[PDB]
Design a protein around this ligand. Structure first.
Ligand SMILES: CCCCCCCCCCCCCCC(=O)OC(COC(=O)CCCCCCCCCCCC(C)C)COC(=O)CCCCCCCCCCCC(C)C
Ligand SMILES: CCCCCCCCCCCCCCC(=O)OC[C@H](COP(=O)(O)OCCN)OC(=O)CCCCCCCCCCCCCC
Ligand code: HEC
Ligand code: HEC
Ligand code: HEC
Ligand code: HEC
Ligand code: HEC
Ligand SMILES: CCCCCCCc1cc(O)c2ccccc2[n+]1[O-]
Lengths: 218, 37, 449, 72
């Protein structure tokens, strides 16, 4: 009463409340920014120098995924296709076109097509495509419906926890090993009984083995 | 002995406000750190 | 003697303590200005050393493959052990009902807070990837990773965070009616609100004093096992290891005793200039210096007992690694640290038994400086010499510190003194209340005869 | 700011015939110290030598090499 006015008590209590809320909001803003789709480049159509259309080339043309990603069932690296593979068909279809001008500019010189890596793992991670494909994990469960993508986006961020989710509960995501390249496959109504059956059939290791550090990191 | 604010009609409204703020902040932190991905 | 000289009133105590703050900045003493200039120059040295460390790496120091912990960890344990005596005066002396805490606890707890502030950067500074100190904290991440919590460094995270937080909380609680006194004693209307919002309208109410005394008692009875657990955990970040100099089980009370020893050395070394430069001879007395040196002598005797325990373990064991640990300390390439440690922690404490030496001020200053040097040598002997020579003799090397960890040490000294000079500028060095309450208690004792 | 930079990728213009992308490939070569060659199995990761191993079919190799052939 000598110094501070009448509303100083309410002002001090509201200041303590607003400081606690501001700390919580700052922690929340930092967490949302580090989990956001902009930061993790998720659900954004990453632009390519040619703007290759997976939707056309799979849902319309009908090219199998192993025609272009030839090394996906044999090595860790799914094959980014060659200009030879593109010009195998594009020596006749839609020639003298400005959107295939970059592909025609390649294969005459040794200069490749500098595609942008949509799914970029940070080089200590060591994903293996061959064991994941051969152990009954389809492309749609981990890359999305790329057969309908005009421009390829990241369906999810490649979090360590998201990887360990399927390494600890694979029965929610395993599929007959013959439905891996099928983009029309959907999991059934129950899926848990057949997931446990397929884990036992393919000998999928327990979550301790699959959650070992040197499975992925190196 | 009794507390300082004993007998004040604003005590249970401000306790419900503090507990509501705590449970909203807790549920929001749980959503961001567990069910956001 | 007495812990309060006669001739003091409550208004005289309030004026004589609160008039060293609340002075205009044009009336700031030249001694404070010179000390703050030296402290700010060494803080610039701190900034230069930290910047070059962050630019280049932790390889600017002398640490190598066998000695991965060096002067960074020595200065960490040194600076975190400075704060134990201030926590003791703030908490254990309140628990024990000792009347000499009333004139040293504010400055000693401020020294504790600034020493913990200097020693909390040292994990982040030595970390090697300094920006990932939060991975040691249990925090929610997208990886699903956790800290191990079986290591002692996770316990160090929890202990250092709890020690800093509860020490700051107890210091602010002990400052709130001093904030009320400064808010009452201020002259300018805009510096009233500086201490008014920190006093929160204290009013000195007897209903508020009951809850205040209960909270201070419970904070003391929580901060005594807090500080013992913090220095036990800082002992444990060597004692949980299999290193022959570090797998020693008397380390938690030994580190408690060494921290209280070095803390009261620094406390005496900073009371004595404060006592002789401010008018605090009536408050900080020769009895205060005598009992602080008595606690120094007791805790230094416990550390000497810990040295005897380590020497007994080495001689009593048939273990070749314990025998070579004793041999390496006695006659190794780093035996200077052990011999100077024995001189500075065993020879220099036998004068402290004597009453005239205990009452003497320059002897106390020399003894406190020698004890601080010898405690740095103790932490050198514990860490560096044990890490230098290990189980495999092929993995033996010498730890030679560079100029950069010495520059960081001088810089953290400057940060500590900068924070201390800011504290003695804007805040009272000693508690305005609980010393007028001490005067009332001594008046009641004189009335009771 | 994002989590990572753009990270461009660079495929071939013509795929190699006997190469699967991502599978390291072993070639039997010969490394000489003082003119006396020893058989080495040098690993080509993507068309480039990265690790020298020993050639078990070779007399002075037997799967093991020396430090000079390893540091070639
Ligand atoms: C290996 C692990 C060992 C576990 C150690 C546990 C010790 C913790 C004790 C905390 C001090 C509280 C005393 C309050 C008080 O001042 O008591 C007053 C009486 O007033 C009261 O009515 C009590 C006030 C509230 C008390 C509630 C305490 C909350 C529970 C603590 C949370 C800890 C967790 C683990 C549950 C008078 O009594 C005293 O003043 C006596 C104080 C005795 C100090 C003990 C000093 C021992 C130092 C050794 C420390 C050991 C290391 C391992 C920590
Ligand atoms: C330092 C790390 C360990 C701290 C543990 C210390 C114990 C703190 C809590 C115990 C409280 C004891 C009850 C209070 C009390 O009686 O002490 C105050 C007492 C009496 O003071 P008056 O009220 O009568 O007035 C006097 C001044 N006006 O004062 C004392 O005499 C102090 C008691 C000494 C305590 C002894 C503890 C020693 C710890 C030894 C640990 C073992 C080490 C083994 C290596
Ligand atoms: C989930 C477990 C996946 C499945 C099933 C398939 N892929 Fe994959 N793909 C996945 C990750 C985590 C990554 C990043 C790897 C890296 O090091 O960045 C990829 C990457 C690709 C790529 C880019 C080239 C490469 O890194 O190999 C392509 C062309 C690709 N994936 C295609 C692809 C196809 C067609 C798949 C089904 C047969 C397939 N991947 C399986 C995750 C997963
Ligand atoms: C043969 C099976 C093909 C391969 C291999 C690739 N493409 Fe193709 N492409 C093919 C067809 C039949 C069509 C559609 C023609 C039509 O009339 O609709 C396309 C389309 C494209 C386009 C669009 C051209 C346009 O619409 O004018 C582009 C830019 C394109 N394809 C690029 C492309 C690249 C870079 C390829 C190698 C990865 C590639 N295609 C493969 C036939 C075939
Ligand atoms: C050749 C005509 C292809 C076929 C058939 C499929 N993909 Fe492809 N894929 C192709 C190219 C030229 C590229 C790089 C350019 C781009 O748009 O990304 C890719 C890349 C992918 C990716 C992105 C991987 C990355 O760069 O991070 C994915 C996820 C991918 N391909 C998956 C995929 C699947 C599941 C397919 C079968 C339905 C498929 N691709 C067909 C070329 C061709
Ligand atoms: C579910 C859709 C998965 C996700 C997401 C990831 N992985 Fe996986 N991984 C999965 C299966 C079914 C298996 C089979 C292993 C078995 O014994 O059944 C694996 C295995 C791997 C391996 C092989 C290592 C080994 O088996 O010893 C690697 C190197 C691997 N996974 C890497 C990896 C990474 C880096 C991931 C995050 C991008 C990841 N996997 C996700 C299923 C799934
Ligand atoms: C494959 C299934 C993995 C296993 C097993 C482990 N980690 Fe992982 N790690 C994996 C991925 C896909 C990522 C990238 C996460 C992202 O958000 O992009 C990581 C990353 C990490 C990190 C973060 C690295 C950084 O931000 O600089 C850490 C700290 C990490 N991984 C640690 C870690 C440890 C210690 C593991 C064993 C217990 C571990 N990961 C398992 C994939 C996988
Ligand atoms: C947010 C508080 C975290 C600060 C303390 C970090 C704990 C910590 C971390 C370390 O790497 C250490 C290495 C050697 C010695 C002590 C250490 N401490 O205490």
């Amino acid at each position: 009463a000598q110094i501070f006015p009448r509303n100083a008590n309410l002002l001090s209590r509201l200041s303590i409340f607003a400081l606690v809320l501001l700390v919580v909001e700052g922690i929340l803003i930092l967490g949302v920014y580090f989990r956001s789709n902009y930061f993790r480049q998720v659900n954004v159509a990453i632009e390519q120098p040619v703007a290759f259309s997976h939707q056309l080339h799979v849902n319309v043309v009908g090219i199998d995924c192993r025609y272009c990603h030839t090394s996906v069932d044999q090595s860790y690296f799914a094959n980014i296709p060659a200009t030879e593979t593109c010009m195998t068909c594009h020596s006749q279809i839609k020639t003298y076109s400005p959107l295939l001008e970059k592909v025609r500019e390649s294969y005459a010189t040794g200069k490749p097509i500098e595609w942008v890596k949509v799914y970029d793992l940070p080089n200590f991670v060591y994903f293996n495509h061959s064991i994941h494909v051969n152990k009954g994990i389809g492309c749609s469960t981990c890359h999305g419906q790329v057969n309908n993508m005009p421009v390829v986006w990241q369906q999810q961020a490649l979090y360590m926890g998201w990887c360990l989710n399927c390494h600890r509960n694979p029965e929610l995501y395993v599929r007959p090993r013959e439905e891996v390249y099928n983009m029309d496959y959907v999991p059934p109504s129950n899926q848990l009984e057949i997931g446990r059956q397929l884990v036992a059939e393919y000998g999928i290791m327990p979550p301790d083995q699959l959650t070992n550090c040197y499975v992925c990191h190196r | 002995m009794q507390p300082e604010w004993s007998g004040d009609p604003e005590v249970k409204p401000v306790f419900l406000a503090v507990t509501l703020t705590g449970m909203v902040a807790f549920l929001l932190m749980v959503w961001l750190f567990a069910f956001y991905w | 003697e007495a812990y309060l000289l006669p001739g003091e009133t409550y208004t005289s105590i309030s004026a004589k303590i609160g008039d060293v703050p609340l002075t205009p900045p044009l009336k700031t003493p030249k001694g404070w200005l010179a000390g703050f200039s030296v402290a700010f120059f060494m803080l610039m040295i701190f900034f230069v050393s930290v910047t070059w460390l962050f630019i280049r790496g932790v390889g600017i120091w002398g640490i190598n493959i066998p000695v991965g912990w060096g002067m960074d960890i020595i200065n960490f344990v040194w600076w975190i052990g400075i704060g134990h005596a201030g926590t003791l005066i703030s908490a254990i002396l309140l628990l024990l009902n000792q009347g000499w805490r009333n004139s040293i606890n504010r400055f000693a707890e401020a020294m504790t807070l600034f020493a913990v502030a200097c020693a909390g950067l040292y994990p982040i500074l030595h970390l090697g990837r300094p920006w990932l100190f939060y991975w040691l904290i249990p925090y929610p991440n997208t990886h699903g990773m956790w800290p191990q919590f079986r290591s002692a460094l996770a316990w160090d995270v929890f202990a250092i965070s709890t020690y800093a937080t509860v020490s700051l909380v107890f210091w602010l609680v002990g400052l709130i009616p001093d904030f009320a006194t400064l808010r009452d004693r201020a002259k300018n209307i805009w510096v009233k609100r500086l201490y008014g919002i920190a006093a929160l309208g204290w009013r000195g109410s007897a209903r508020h004093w009951h809850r205040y005394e209960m909270a201070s008692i419970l904070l003391a009875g929580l901060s005594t096992p807090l500080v013992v657990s913090v220095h036990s955990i800082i002992s444990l970040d060597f004692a949980i290891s299999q290193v022959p100099g570090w797998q020693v089980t008397v380390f938690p009370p030994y580190f408690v005793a060494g921290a209280v020893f070095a803390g009261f050395a620094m406390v005496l070394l900073l009371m004595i200039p404060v006592r002789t430069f401010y008018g605090f001879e009536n408050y900080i007395t020769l009895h205060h210096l005598d009992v602080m040196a008595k606690v120094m002598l007791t805790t230094g005797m416990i550390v000497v007992y810990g040295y005897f325990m380590e020497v007994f373990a080495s001689l009593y064991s048939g273990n070749e690694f314990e025998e070579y640990l004793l041999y390496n300390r006695l006659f190794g390439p780093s035996s200077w640290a052990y011999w100077g440690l024995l001189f500075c922690n065993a020879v220099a404490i036998q004068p402290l038994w004597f009453k005239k030496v205990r009452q003497n001020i320059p002897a106390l200053l020399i003894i406190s400086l020698i004890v601080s040097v010898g405690m740095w040598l103790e932490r050198y002997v514990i860490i560096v010499i044990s890490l230098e020579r290990d189980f495999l003799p092929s993995s033996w090397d010498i730890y030679i510190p560079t100029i950069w960890d010495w520059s960081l040490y001088i810089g953290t000294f400057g940060l500590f003194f900068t924070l201390l000079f800011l504290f003695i500028r804007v805040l009272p060095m000693i508690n305005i209340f609980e010393m007028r309450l001490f005067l009332y208690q001594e008046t009641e004792k004189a009335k009771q005869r | 700011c994002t989590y990572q930079p753009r990270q461009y990728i660079a495929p071939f213009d013509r795929q190699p015939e006997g190469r699967v992308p991502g599978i390291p490939q072993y070639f039997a070569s010969t490394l000489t110290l003082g003119g006396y060659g020893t058989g080495v199995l040098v690993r080509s990761n993507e068309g480039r030598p990265t690790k020298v191993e020993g050639n078990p079919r070779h007399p002075a190799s037997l799967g093991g090499t020396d430090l000079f052939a390893q540091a070639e």
